[PDB]
Structure 1
């Protein structure tokens, strides 16, 4: 509740041109988050 409050862009596959952001959700637990959930045992 002290995280969100306001106001998204929203999540579109192009965030920044051209900053390749891995932090996109592919679709729900984005790709870098997938790396640090798969590699953690």
Structure 2
């Protein structure tokens, strides 16, 4: 995967650098309260 992956075709599915922008945004707009493992206690 290269940052200019599909030239004339803008792709927001790339990795910001690992959880591409659309994945991150999808996880943000959902309301989840997961316990930080190593820290939940």
Same fold (TM over 0.5): yes
Correspondence for 1:35:
25
Structure 1 unaligned residues grouped into runs of 5+: 1-10
Aligned residues: CA RMSD: 0.7
Give the number of equivalent residue pairs: 31
The whole-number CA distance in structure 2 between the counterparts of 1:18 and 1:40 is 31
Q: Which runs of 4+ in 1 moved over 6 A?
A: none
TM-score, normalised to structure 1, is 0.67
Greater C-alpha Rg? 2
The whole-number CA distance in structure 2 between the counterparts of 1:27 and 1:14 is 14
